Design a protein around this ligand. Sequence first.
Ligand SMILES: CO[C@@H]1[C@H](O)[C@@H](COP(=O)(O)O[P@@](=O)(S)OP(=O)(O)O)O[C@H]1n1c[n+](C)c2c(=O)[nH]c(N)nc21
Length: 180
Amino acid sequence: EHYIKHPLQNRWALWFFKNDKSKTWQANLRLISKFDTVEDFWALYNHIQLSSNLMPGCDYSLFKDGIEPMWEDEKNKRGGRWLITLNKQQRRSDLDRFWLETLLCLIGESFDDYSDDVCGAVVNVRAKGDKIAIWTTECENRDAVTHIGRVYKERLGLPPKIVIGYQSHADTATKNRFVV
Ligand SMILES: CO[C@@H]1[C@H](O)[C@@H](COP(=O)(O)O[P@@](=O)(S)OP(=O)(O)O)O[C@H]1n1c[n+](C)c2c(=O)[nH]c(N)nc21
């Protein structure tokens, strides 16, 4: 009642990446903490830096517990990502609101029967332009990928004029598979 936390459908892990050239890419990836209730999500979100305030070269990742935010995870190797590319002006205007909306689409299971295809999301803070992406587990599942892309674009509020693409991790690791 007035004392039980509200369990989320999934337990989530927040990851941090800091670009450091002394280390391999994988060694720069670090798990911050995990949560599985509404209350613990907000406690964590409220304690950490907004993405717009991180140094260029850093990432946040939020993934279902047990899935690492890397292509080589069994749940990512056959998958891909719906990519949101932000210009440098949208660092100020949309980065933080887009990322929080992305976080909520994940923990709120916003993609109906296809929320099981979601692995996680990643925001890259970069000088050349930031990126936000939702990662899904199977790039050949056209129906799941397309529905997630349509729900995502509308939850972000992007105008029907704007087009976003989905790329497979196989292609990234070595073009768009889908567009909405
Ligand atoms: C090794 O090279 C990979 C990739 O080319 C590099 C940069 O990925 P990045 O996502 O930073 O692309 P950007 O264009 S946003 O980066 P930048 O050019 O602006 O600094 O980081 C590595 N990388 C990245 N990811 C997501 C993986 C992974 O999942 N697995 C392995 N093994 N490597 C990975």
